[model samples]
Structures are given as structure tokens and as C-alpha cells.
Target: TSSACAPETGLQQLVATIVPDEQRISFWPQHFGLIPQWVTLEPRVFGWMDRLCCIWNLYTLNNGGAFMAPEETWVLFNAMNGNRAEMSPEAAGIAACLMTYSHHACRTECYAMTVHYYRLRDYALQHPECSAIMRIID
Candidate 1:
């Protein structure tokens, strides 16, 4: 029973603090690509991170991803990978945007997850990908 503060508000506060100011951005994160200690600045942030990891791994493995229909799952694999037809054309920028936002957290449950997801989005946006897959997959 997650309470003590609203998830949406708690998550909003959590991510809002994650990035810090432009000058301090480089100081974010610890040595080994760890999330910054600032995440633990609030108890809600702790609870939400744990809670959403479970939600993300479970739900995401079964039903999440930019992919939608079960048939869409194989679309990511290529002909060289074997028995596959083609890409999931149904997915587009709008779908990517919505799924990007919804990829990790439910709106009412853990908005903080969006913060994590954006790090992925922002990273993919900034750095060039090594493979064509990453360029489109994220």
C-alpha cells in the first residue's frame, strides 16, 4: 500500500531534482554510472524507484516496449536474425513519444520512471548510436 505522498507528485519532485542545474549537470551521477545520491534525498524517491523497477521489469518483459502487439515483438529482429518479416510500421513518432513517456511508469503510480526514461531518450538524442537498431529502437 504505497502512500505517505502522492505518487505523481512524489515522482515529479524526484525527477525534478535529478537533473539539477546546467552547471551542476556534469557533477550528477557517481563513478560507475550510478544514479546520483540525490535520488535518495527523499524517502518517496527510494520507495518509488524500488516499486517501479519491479513494475518495469515485470510489465515491460510481458507487455511494454515501443512494441505493442505480440506480433510486433519479432519486428525488432532482422532477416539475418532469422524467421522475421519486417518492422512494426504501426509505431511512429507519436507512438514513440507516448510510449517513451509511458515506457516505465504509469502516470498515477510512478512518474519518476519517466525521468529515468528521458535519460534514455535524451541520451539517444544526443549521442549517435553504434547500430541502426538503437537509432530507431529507442
Candidate 2:
């Protein structure tokens, strides 16, 4: 009998430079790439999953994934976890589909996340395998 506990999940361990505190850090709104104009979000503004997801997308755009920056990885944790706003994840879903439909990256996990956040898991009915691979700790 292999009685073993799975390793703990990942936290918000940032590979990027943590914003220093010695200097006064001011929040800045970032472009979600959703609209033409950049709506400023408070910098280091924690709470909203959309921000994390966007950061995840930024990481992917910067080449931070397993051989590829798949959207499934981005969309799920990106939105739909805490807040019930449902729009951010939906937006991420759009991003995922856009990336997928355009054949930009690969046939990956973006679409499924779209479904999850939208509270429309049934729409992502074809992605059982994808759901098992990706996860988030924070």
C-alpha cells in the first residue's frame, strides 16, 4: 500500500521581483488588455482574482509555462475563485479562446477555465483531462 500524501500546493510565490517597501509604493491601474484604454488598477492591489490571472497571463506572455503558456493555466486561477463577479474569468475565457482559436499557442486549457469562471462548467464538458492537470494553492 503506497500511503503517501501529495505535496502541498503552490502559494503566491512570485518569481518576479517583489515590490520593495523602502520606497513608497503607489498603486497603478493596469491594462487588462480587455479594452482600448488602460483602466488603472491599484498597483500590488491584492484581492481580485482577475489581477492574479492577468499576472499569470503576463507570465505566460513572458514564456512561463510547461513548454507552453497554456490558457487553461491562466483562466481558472485568474478568475472565478473568490469573487462572484464572473466577468473577469469570462474575459479571461475570451482571451483563452482567442489564443486557442487563432492557433497561436496550442490546444490547451484556456477554454475550460472560461467555463469554470462563468459558472458554466457544462459548457466545458469536453475537458476532463485538462481539469485534472492544473491547480492553484492561493
Candidate 3:
């Protein structure tokens, strides 16, 4: 809960703008359609978040994409690797999604998702919560 580590206005605005119903629907297929088991990406991302943070709800969008909102505030950690980070719920959500993409892209060897992963990662890294996000990734 350090003031300096709080989610930035730019990060909040990016989440608000991109996570809306309209944009979320295309998130998976747009970035991951070519990969095998693309349909499982949403649930897998949710699963990752469930382990990394405290999830309050799993909301299904009109277009069938699922968004997992974390508790108001939470710490993300990995028991296996012992990496940890603290941030707002929205930031945690984005971090979870980005990590999921990074994992799957490497697993499936999908060049497209690899590109998109870096795009999202670079964008997230520009926010104040970048260090926290990187900790989670580590």
C-alpha cells in the first residue's frame, strides 16, 4: 500500500478503456485464435489469478469473454517461484492476463501471441506499478 507503488492514473485509464465489454470480447481470439486450445485461454487466465490473488468475482461479458476482478486490494504471489507484488485490483487483473499470455505464447510457440504479449507488457511497464508487475512475472 505504498503511495509510490499505487496504480497510476494512466494504468487505470488503460484498464478502463480496454476492459470494457466491447473490447474484451475480441481479446482472446484476436490475439490467440491461431493457437491450439485458444478457447481455454480465458479460463486459464482466471485460474492464474485465482492462485496469484484474491478474486471477488468472475464476470462474463456479452461476447462471452470472462473478466476476473480481484478484491479491492491484494498482493500477488507465486508459491512455486516465490515472486510477489502488491497493487490495486485492476492492476493485478491486468498483470494476471499478461502473464497468462506470456506463458501460453511460449508454451504454444505462437509468434503472434508473443508479439502481442510484449506489446501489453511494454504498455503495462510504463505505469507506476511496473515494478510490482515485474515482480509477479519473476
Candidate 4:
């Protein structure tokens, strides 16, 4: 029989690097540059996470590096569709960001943003939590 991965304990590692102060200004534009309302993307990401029912922790390093981590694993549910998915905190965060990108891409009719969304979406789909992520997005 195949062995499953060990269970995680304590804090999970950050999914992405902390955005340094020098690069923070360009962080959104770097990822969402194609969108006309790129300036509001960061807050919009947070908004999507809130709607996704994921609690988050924001960290600021002494060297001016800042990033967000999830508080813990949680269940993601879409009220409108009654869809539910259980995911690790990290995956939840990524899913939220993906939803944000997809929403904005559709709103602006920006093919470039849609391309960005699909790229990240493919990455998320490869994650161990892919099944649950797909359930939520589907």
C-alpha cells in the first residue's frame, strides 16, 4: 500500500516570499499589470480571502519585508452555489487570490489577466489540495 504524507503540525510555511518594502510598490503591478485597476488589487485580494472564510496573519519583518500567512485550515463555501471545499490554509489563500484575479479579468475583459489567472490556476490545480480547490472553483 502507498503511504500518505505526514500530517502537518504547528505553523505551515509561507507559500510565497515576503514582499520587501522596495518591491512592495510594484508587487501588484508586477502580477496584475494588465488590469486597469491594478492599484486596488491588493485590498481586493484581502476582500476575496474574507469571502472565502479564511483567516490570515500579516507579518512585517524588521528588514521591511511583509507577507501574509493563514491562521489555520478552514472550510471554503460558496453561499450562492452551496459548494463546499476543505483546504489547508495555504491553499485557501492561493484560491482566494485566484478568485480575485479571475473576477477582475472577467470584469475588464482583459485577455492578459485571464492568461495570468490560468497560469496561476494551473499551479493551484497541481497542489495536493487540488481536488478541493477545483470543487470550490467549479
Which one is best on TM-score?
Answer: 4
How accurate locally, in lDDT, is each candidate? 0.29, 0.27, 0.63, 0.63
lDDT of 1 by residue, 1-138 (tens): 111232332212111112234523333222112323333323332333233221010011111111111113213322323322223322222123324344335643454445544433433333232133243443
| The candidate that achieves the highest lDDT relative to the unseen native structure | 3
- Model 3 C-alpha lDDT per residue in residues 13-131, reported as the tens digit of each score: 33323355666556656545667778987787788888897534433322222334455568788886798777888678767877787888888887655655655665566657788
Which 10 successive residues of model 3 have the least lDDT summed?
Answer: 1-10
C-alpha RMSD by candidate, in order: 15.2, 15.3, 9.1, 10.5
> How does candidate 1 score on lDDT?
0.29
Extract clashing residue pairs from model 2: 27-43, 28-43, 29-40, 29-41, 30-41, 53-78, 72-109, 72-110
| Regions of model 2 farther than 4 Å from truth | 1-14, 22-39, 43-47, 50-133, 136-138
lDDT score of residue 57 within candidate 2: 25
Point out where model 4 deviates above 4 Å. 1-22, 55-71
* Number of colliding residue pairs in model 1: 0
State the lDDT at 116 in candidate 3. Answer: 50
Worst 10 residues of 4 by lDDT: 1-10
